[PDB]
Structure formats: C-alpha cells, structure tokens
C-alpha cells in the first residue's frame, strides 16, 4: 500500500497533478521451479 | 553526498532527497542498560525486530492559522502493533527513539518549522485562578494525546509558561522550506530510574511548530501536510504481568 | 552459482551520507538496493537451485508444430502431402520462441501418423525431406520417391513414432523471426506490402509423406509434427507478445478491440 | 563531474549541463569486424572521419496529445552526406552508432519520455482481416520513415503487438524534465550477420513515446521540441558498384 | 549557422524571450602576416 | 567547495552562497611599494586596519531603462572614514582594491550586467563642436561622481568613443541572474608613479552596465538594487600636510 505521508505541496503557476511510474523487478535470491504452460493464451484461430 | 540519507532499522526503509545532518541528542546513543546501573532481577526480554521499526503515523495539515502539534511518544505508539503489544504486558521499560518529520512543499512555498523534543514536558494549565477548587488542570487527552496528537493555545509560550525562543537549548532542527524537506533526530534513554512505566509516564514530547508562515501564491497547492515517523531503539521490558490499557 | 543466494546478518544505521533506497531511474539501470543494506535481515543459506530456468531446459520440450492431411481419395485424390517446414502455425511454441531476436539450435522431430476415426493398420509411409531446391514430388507414384541423395524414413503405423535429428542448416550464423527489411531491391509500394519482413534465412523445404503401394488404399491419415529443440543458445531478449495472433507469417494484431496487458479492478485504493 | 559532458566525434561536439550517465548497449562497444568473423574478401574502406560525426534531423514539436515517433538508424542518414553517398555506392555495411535525444524545458513543466532502441523493429499492421488478400500491411514509409520519422497510432502496444510495459528490457533511458534533459545511448553492431545491406534492412530502430503527458501552466513556454543526433561509429563499407537509391 | 535543436522551453509566470551574447577569440595556432593600414577610418577633420 | 566564500578584511565580513572564483586582475597582487621603485624619502604610515576594510555604498535601483553606473575608486571612498580622513592629509598614496558588486534576485527573473575596471578611465564630452569656447566637457561631478556614483547616456561607447563589445579586454566579470548573484575582482595599484594624489587623479573606475535587460512576468518583486563594497588593500600614504578638502 502506498500512502501520503506529509502532502504534495506545489508552488503556483505550477500544475498540482503529478504522476508515479511503479517499475518491479527480481532479487538474487529469486529462483523458480516446475515448468508449465501458461494461461495467458488459451484459443487461437487456424493460421 | 550528504543532502541523501537512506535509514533502515528493522523491515522499513526512508529514503530522502533533500536533508541536513542527522542529530544526535546530546552526544549519547541509544543503548542496553548496563548490569552496574541495572536494579530489577528478573531477565528482560529484547525482541530486537518487532518493536525496532518505523511506526508512521497520521498525517496534519499545515494551514495559515496553524499554531503547532505535540506528542507523547512511550504513548503515541503504545496501542500500535507489537511494541505496544509488549508494553501493556511489562511492568519496566527501556529504550531510545529514532525520529523523522517529513514536511515537503514546492519551490515557491515559504516558511519554517521548529522540530525538537523537550525531556519531561509537562502541560501547563490556563487560567488565573489560584483555589484549589478552581484551579484549571489539562485533561488526560492533553496530557496523554495519543496516537492522534494535540495543538497549542499560545505556543509563544509552549503552552507551559517557558518561552519558544529560549527552547533552542534542547536537541532541536529546523525544517526550512527553501533548504530542506525533512528532520532527524536520535534521542537515547533520558531518566533518572534506569526503568520506568511506559504508561503512566512519558519520558519526552515531539513538538512541531511553524514560526515562519506558511504562504503560497494564488494557484499552487494547498494541502501541505505533517507526517512523522518513529522508531524504538533498542528496547526493553520487564516484569511480566497481565496487559493492562491504561 | 549452483544455488540462488546467500543473506548476511544486517543492522540498523543512523548517520548521514549513504542512502542506498535512492536508486534514480532515469539512468536506465536498474536498483542496485539490497536486503543488507536495508531492514534487518539474518544470516540464511539457500539451496535452492537454479538449474531448471536455464534456455537449454526451457526449450528442451517438444510441442506441436504441423499438421498434414492426406485424404488418398480414388477420383480426385492427390496421393503426397508436402508441408512447408515452419514453426509459427501454432502460438504456443512461437510464443514460448518470440522472447528473443536471434537463436541457434538443433532439432529432433518426431512424426506421429493415425487414422480418421482412430486404427493403426500396419500400412507402411514413407517420410520425405525435399531441401530447397529439390524438386516436389507430384503424384504418389512420382519420380521423386526414388530417395536418392536424398533423406527419406520407411516406418508403418503399428511401428512406434519415427524420430529424426536435424542439425544446424541456416545460411547465416543464426536464426531470426524478425528481420526489418525486405528480401529485394527496387521500388517498394505503399498500398500492400507483402513483401516486408519475410525472413529470408529461415526457409527449410518442404516436408513430404506418401504410402507406398500400387494401387490406392481408402484411408484418410493425419500425421503430426513435434519439434524439440536442443543445443540451443538465444540472443536479444524481446518482450513478450500480449496480442492474440492473426497470421501465419505476419505479427498482426486488431486495431480497434485491444486486449489490456491486465485484468480490470473495481478501484485503484483496493487490491482485491 | 558527472551531470556534465561533451561528446566529440569527428568535427562535431555535444555539450549538455543536465544529464545522466551513457548508457552502453548490452555491455559491447562498436568494434570492427574481426578477420575470423569475415566472410567477404574484398578490403573494406574506412573513412573514419566524413563518416563519423554527429548528424542532426530535424526537430518535432511535442504537443499535449502526441503518442510518439520512430525511426530506422540505417535508413534515417541514407541520404544526407558522406555516410549516405558511401552508403549508396556499396553494398555491404557494418557500424555501430551513437545516440542522443535533446529535451529542455522550464522547471515548472512536468513530463516524462522514455527513449530505447529495438533490434529489429517490425512495423505490424492494424486490422482484423485474416484473408490474404485484404490483410493491411505497412507502407514504405510507414516501414522506411527515413529522414523525418513516422508516428504512433496504438504506442500502448508499441505499434507491433508488444506491450510498452515489458520494452525496458532493451536498452533504454528516462527523460524526466525534473531531473535531466538529455539521454544518450551507444549502441553497436547487432546483426547475425558480419555484413549487411544499408537499404533493404534496417537493423534496429529509435523510439521516444511521452508515457508522463506534458503538462503546463498558462503563461509558460508552449514550443517543445525533440531534437535527436546520431553518430556513426565504426563505419565499414564493401562491395563497391554503381550508387543505387533504394 | 545557429539552429534550434529541441525547443525554447519555459514554465508559466515568466518570460518567454530569452537573449544569448556572442563572444568570439582566437586560438592558439592563431598567427598573422605582412602588415597594413587599417580600413576603419579614410577622412579626418583638420585637429 | 567554490560557489561558497566568506571574505574577511578587517572588522568585516562577505558572505555568499552563489558566486563564480575570484578575478585576480592581471595576475598580480596588491603588495607595498619595494624600496627601489620609491622616490620620496620620508616614511608612509601603514595604518593595516582603520583603513583596511569594506566599505559599503548606497544601493541603486535597476529599472528595466536602466543604462549603468560608473564610480572613481580613490574618489568614492574619499570623504567617508579614517581612510578619507587619512586621504585628505596626506599628498602621496598608494592602496590596491577588493570588490564586490551584489545583485540578487529570484529564478524568474532574467538578465545579465557586466562589472569591470577600466585604468585610466576618462570620460568623454558629447557634442559636435570644433571650437575650443563651445567645445563640450563633462562637469566635476560627471569625472569624479563621489560616493553616489554617475550614469551613463551612450553606454554602448563607454561614453567615451570606445565600443562595449571590445571592454572584454579589461579584468571584467559577468552577474548572470542565472548563475551567480555576485562578482568578486581584486585589482592591484596601476599607475605610471609609485605614489600619487589620491584627490586630483582617480587611478582606475568601476563600471555595472546591463546589456541583457531585466525582465520578469507581472506578479514578481520589482525591487532590484545593485550594492557595491570596496575594501582598500594595502594603503599607504606621504606627505603629510594639513587636511584639504579637494
């Protein structure tokens, strides 16, 4: 969960909407196991 | 080099951008009790990751008419996960705070804030009246605020007959909207018991008050607020017994 | 590294000048911020093992590649079925294969044929490699069918399924799927350009099957191609597609209709 | 000492007062083909300095609703001075390059651009026919933008079916107008051949999308261009004949 | 020739006219030859 | 470590937190008059403290019509302290100078002054008369301004014939609103004479001239004053008569 902490205060003559961009990545600890298939595709059209 | 700090104590992290130096009140560090100073006889327990962390607290917003917030701190995180868990259970407690107050704003905004702790910082009744039976006492939510926290009436004088300009004297910082966004301050154990009741005595007060005002031009943002974390160096509890609440 | 990763015992610290938490993103590199240099950790070996996520042990499954029919009729039939050595029919082993620019590989595939309804009669086939080139056979009674200086597998079907290794037969160092460009040269048009991104050093032959008899047999096989991959090294990594696939040998998708990369939420200040 | 630099090559100089650290494509400099790597026979040439140089396309103005703009690096230069004539006489052609995108604006605009190379880009058209002879397919200068550029219709997918959440696996960097200006990216040679064409294939492709839109203030600056040079480094050219256009 | 390369970027409340001043030296190759008369100054009044 | 300095000469004290490195004029220091360039025979007094300090001017509003000002060093701070007091009894001197212009402002506004010394800087009459009885002069307070200072009419000749573009060539040092807010050059004693007057004859003259104009949008400060300060180096001073006026 992300939370306001103090505010976001902005001068004026300043637009008072900003954005975050969220980026994820892995550790060196990281590791995987049993291969599968995906479920991120399931139909398909004859091609 | 120095205006960046990352602080990490236990599971949590802050990170900074725009910071002075870190200070540390009176030259001590938080540390264990030693076994020459020590009087109770049963082991004291030292959970050493539960209750050393960063307990954020709620965040206050800064208007034009603010005139300052304080708090209780063995009484703001004392109902709030596993250090005030261990608490209610001990009888004795032990331990230093880690302290940052986040205030940010643009580069347009002005003013200034006054962020220090006051050991024994007793509140101050308000009134002219010198019978017993009149006589105007502070109640248990102005004593005791709370996780929440409590305002000035007349912060010119600390709401407790000792004036502002002379409390520089205590490990203070300031919070200059133009220089920085943040402050920190690390506070060891300051009693005269080597332990003492978390709960029916507070060591010290956080004190936020805004001497320069805070002003903005037409069109910029307006919500400007107050966040504070703590943390709880090195703690230590003793004499087990049943939780109590207050 | 025959495990993942070790944790050393951590502290707390409270001084100014390091802050490893203020990893800046504009750099294009990515955050450094360890377990150490953050809340307090202990001291954990890990066996854990990193074999199993290695290309040679991804790629290392077999899959389905191609399909061929053979209707042998007696009045309109047509005896061979070539089919064109491929493997982005099917979008399971393009997907899995997509994920990187440029590989390198060997093959063994392997050929299981059945009949119609379900039957293994022990009718004998003839398995046929044309390299490009070679000229294809027309007719089941061809002149092709001679098989020599050319690779050919007699195997029936109550045999168990033929299996084959090919080797590494690219005209260039390695494999692509995707070349930006185009095969000719000249004047290139502007309203269909079929001619854009064919991969020119991709094209294997064409696979062909036959029975081998004299006179027909009334029967309706279905051969099926799987293709597994070994020896395999990968260059280049792309992202993965999140487009349904449209064409064979076009990465297409539908301009209006897009699928979102995630599902949707009732708000942003809830995670369920 | 390091928000600062000058890139020299040849007879050309970039100088920036805002930027980050170069970054360097998959950890390989642009080097010339070794002679076990070879495969032609004919000495190749090397002008080493008419064709090594910082050349400078036009600028394109990044309006509220823009989606973004690509090219092709072995295409965008084809025409324009010694690198594009020497590349039109010959037939084989192997460099690395240099890249640098300029973006500067106040510091009350707010923004951000991520600019990344793709190895071979393919361009994939929009449309829902599957039969072969109605299946859109890109045009020339949709393909080969050459010179000036080709925008975005869908740059959520990046225009080829690929999501722009998973392109920071190339090599990439953020232009944020709070913290820099400028972005720069060596590249070298990626091909899986020694030598290639320089006009029937391109090799990778430039990308700047705004994901962060532009924002602003009235009163404030409304022109904000994107300015890009490219160098090429480590030219090499084979198979001399007769200039050929496309 | 001086060219405009990105743009003239600017937040709101303040100006959007900037100027840049033009200096110009030598270097340290520099060198000159057979002297003359300046043509900076051909009349001149009787002093 | 160098936009940072802290001058101290004397009893005072210039502080600042946005500067450029000091300008050492032609690579010389102010240091005392060696015994074989001398010619007079009777012995300076060296006073090292009274006289040895930093003199603060008035300030000047800076205009958006404004021109630029000019003063006349061992005039300016002739008639103002115990080294005007020891300047006017005396008939020889001899003294080097530091200085220091401020000029402050927000990151809203623009525009950039040019501070430089100019030796020997004598100003020119305007007019178009040959006539030796109509011929113009400037007026004692045009040549020595005093301690208030003088404009300019025609500042892009100096106001005496010789072009701005080419007073590059003096020790000079540019306040660009942008970068810094003060300029700092310490001039040695330039004279043809070992010791002078230090009444009749101005050695050198201190010239602000801004060439890009101060503008800002409606809204800002509009206040903005140019303050300069002189510190006097290594004075010395013969002849020792009764106390003229000038």
Same mark, same amino acid.
């Given at each position: 969960?992300?939370?306001?902490?103090?505010?976001?205060?902005?001068?004026?003559?300043?637009?008072?909407?900003?954005?975050?961009?969220?980026?994820?990545?892995?550790?060196?600890?990281?590791?995987?196991?049993?291969?599968?298939?995906?479920?991120?595709?399931?139909?398909?059209?004859?091609? | 080099?120095?205006?960046? !700090?990352?602080?990490?104590?236990?599971?949590?992290?802050?990170?900074?951008?725009?910071? !002075?130096?870190?200070?540390?009140?009176?030259?001590? @560090?938080?540390? /264990?009790?030693?076994?020459?100073?020590?009087?109770?006889?049963?082991?004291?327990?030292?959970?050493?990751?539960?209750?050393?962390?960063?307990?954020?607290?709620?965040?206050?917003?800064?208007?034009?008419?603010?005139?300052? @917030?304080? @708090?209780?701190?063995?009484?703001?995180?004392?109902?709030?996960?596993?250090?005030?868990?261990?608490?209610?259970?001990?009888?004795? /407690? =032990?331990?230093?705070?880690?302290?940052?107050?986040?205030?940010?704003?643009?580069?347009?905004?002005?003013?200034?804030?006054?962020?220090?702790?006051?050991?024994?910082?007793?509140?101050?009744? =308000?009134?002219?009246?010198?019978?017993?039976?009149?006589?105007?006492?502070?109640?248990?939510?102005?004593?005791?605020?709370?996780?929440?926290?409590?305002?000035?009436?007349?912060? /010119?004088?600390?709401?407790?007959?000792?004036?502002?300009?002379?409390?520089?004297?205590?490990?203070?910082? @300031?919070?200059?909207?133009?220089?920085?966004?943040?402050?920190?301050?690390?506070?060891? /154990?300051?009693? !005269?018991?080597?332990?003492?009741? !978390?709960?029916?005595?507070?060591?010290?007060?956080?004190?936020?008050?805004?001497?320069?005002?805070?002003?903005?031009?037409?069109?910029?943002?307006?919500?400007?607020?107050?966040?504070?974390?703590?943390?709880?160096?090195?703690?230590?509890?003793?004499?087990? =017994?049943?939780?109590?609440?207050? | 590294?025959?495990?993942?990763?070790?944790?050393?015992?951590?502290?707390?610290?409270?001084?100014?000048?390091?802050?490893?938490?203020?990893?800046?993103?504009?750099?294009?590199?990515?955050?450094?911020?360890?377990?150490?240099?953050?809340?307090?950790?202990?001291?954990?070996?890990?066996?854990?093992?990193?074999?199993?996520?290695?290309?040679?042990?991804?790629?290392?499954?077999?899959?389905?590649?191609?399909? +061929?029919?053979?209707?042998? $009729?007696?009045?309109?039939?047509?005896?061979?079925?070539?089919?064109?050595?491929?493997?982005?029919?099917?979008?399971?082993?393009?997907? *899995?294969?997509?994920?990187?620019?440029?590989?390198?590989?060997?093959?063994?595939?392997?050929?299981?044929?059945?009949?119609?309804?379900?039957?293994?009669?022990?009718?004998?086939?003839?398995?046929?490699?044309?390299?490009?080139?070679?000229?294809?056979?027309?007719?089941?009674?061809?002149?092709?069918?001679?098989?020599?200086?050319?690779?050919?597998?007699?195997?029936?079907?109550?045999?168990?399924?033929?299996?084959?290794? +090919?080797?590494?037969?690219?005209?260039?160092?390695?494999?692509?799927?995707?070349?930006? $460009?185009?095969?000719?040269?000249?004047?290139?048009?502007?309203?269909?350009?079929?001619?854009?991104?064919?991969?020119?050093?991709?094209?294997?032959?064409?696979?062909?099957?036959? +029975?081998?008899?004299?006179?027909?047999?009334?029967?309706?096989?279905?051969?099926?191609?799987?293709?597994?991959?070994?020896?395999?090294?990968?260059?280049?990594?792309?992202?993965?597609?999140?487009?349904?696939?449209?064409?064979?040998?076009?990465?297409?998708?539908?301009?209006?209709?897009?699928?979102?990369?995630?599902?949707?939420?009732?708000?942003? *200040?809830?995670?369920?």
């Amino acid at each position: 969960t992300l939370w306001y902490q103090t505010n976001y205060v902005v001068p004026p003559e300043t637009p008072g909407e900003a954005y975050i961009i969220a980026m994820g990545a892995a550790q060196d600890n990281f590791t995987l196991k049993i291969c599968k298939d995906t479920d991120e595709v399931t139909q398909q059209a004859v091609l | 080099s120095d205006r960046v !700090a990352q602080l990490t104590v236990g599971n949590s992290s802050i990170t900074t951008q725009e910071a !002075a130096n870190i200070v540390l009140a009176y030259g001590e @560090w938080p540390e /264990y009790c030693p076994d020459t100073d020590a009087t109770a006889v049963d082991k004291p327990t030292r959970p050493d990751v539960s209750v050393n962390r960063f307990y954020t607290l709620d965040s206050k917003m800064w208007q034009e008419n603010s005139t300052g @917030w304080y @708090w209780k701190f063995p009484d703001v995180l004392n109902k709030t996960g596993v250090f005030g868990q261990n608490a209610q259970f001990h009888y004795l /407690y =032990r331990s230093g705070f880690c302290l940052h107050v986040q205030c940010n704003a643009s580069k347009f905004h002005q003013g200034a804030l006054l962020v220090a702790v006051i050991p024994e910082f007793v509140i101050a009744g =308000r009134g002219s009246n010198t019978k017993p039976n009149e006589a105007p006492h502070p109640g248990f939510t102005t004593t005791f605020p709370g996780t929440t926290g409590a305002t000035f009436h007349d912060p /010119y004088v600390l709401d407790s007959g000792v004036p502002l300009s002379q409390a520089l004297i205590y490990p203070h910082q @300031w919070i200059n909207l133009r220089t920085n966004n943040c402050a920190t301050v690390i506070v060891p /154990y300051i009693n !005269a018991v080597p332990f003492d009741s !978390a709960i029916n005595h507070s060591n010290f007060g956080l004190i936020v008050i805004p001497v320069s005002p805070l002003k903005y031009s037409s069109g910029a943002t307006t919500a400007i607020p107050i966040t504070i974390t703590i943390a709880p160096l090195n703690s230590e509890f003793g004499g087990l =017994r049943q939780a109590v609440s207050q | 590294a025959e495990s993942a990763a070790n944790t050393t015992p951590s502290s707390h610290r409270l001084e100014t000048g390091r802050v490893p938490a203020l990893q800046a993103a504009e750099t294009g590199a990515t955050s450094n911020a360890t377990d150490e240099n953050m809340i307090e950790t202990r001291c954990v070996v890990n066996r854990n093992g990193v074999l199993e996520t290695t290309i040679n042990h991804f790629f290392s499954r077999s899959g389905l590649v191609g399909v +061929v029919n053979l209707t042998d $009729g007696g009045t309109d039939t047509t005896g061979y079925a070539t089919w064109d050595i491929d493997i982005m029919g099917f979008v399971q082993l393009r997907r *899995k294969c997509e994920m990187f620019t440029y590989m390198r590989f060997n093959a063994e595939f392997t050929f299981v044929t059945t009949t119609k309804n379900g039957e293994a009669r022990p009718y004998m086939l003839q398995y046929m490699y044309v390299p490009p080139g070679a000229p294809k056979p027309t007719g089941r009674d061809a002149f092709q069918w001679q098989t020599a200086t050319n690779p050919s597998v007699f195997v029936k079907l109550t045999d168990p399924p033929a299996q084959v290794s +090919v080797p590494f037969m690219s005209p260039a160092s390695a494999y692509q799927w995707f070349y930006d $460009g185009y095969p000719t040269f000249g004047q290139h048009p502007e309203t269909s350009n079929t001619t854009y991104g064919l991969c020119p050093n991709n094209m294997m032959g064409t696979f062909a099957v036959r +029975v081998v008899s004299r006179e027909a047999s009334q029967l309706k096989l279905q051969t099926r191609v799987y293709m597994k991959l070994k020896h395999v090294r990968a260059w280049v990594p792309r992202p993965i597609r999140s487009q349904p696939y449209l064409l064979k040998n076009f990465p297409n998708y539908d301009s209006s209709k897009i699928t979102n990369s995630a599902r949707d939420r009732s708000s942003i *200040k809830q995670a369920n």
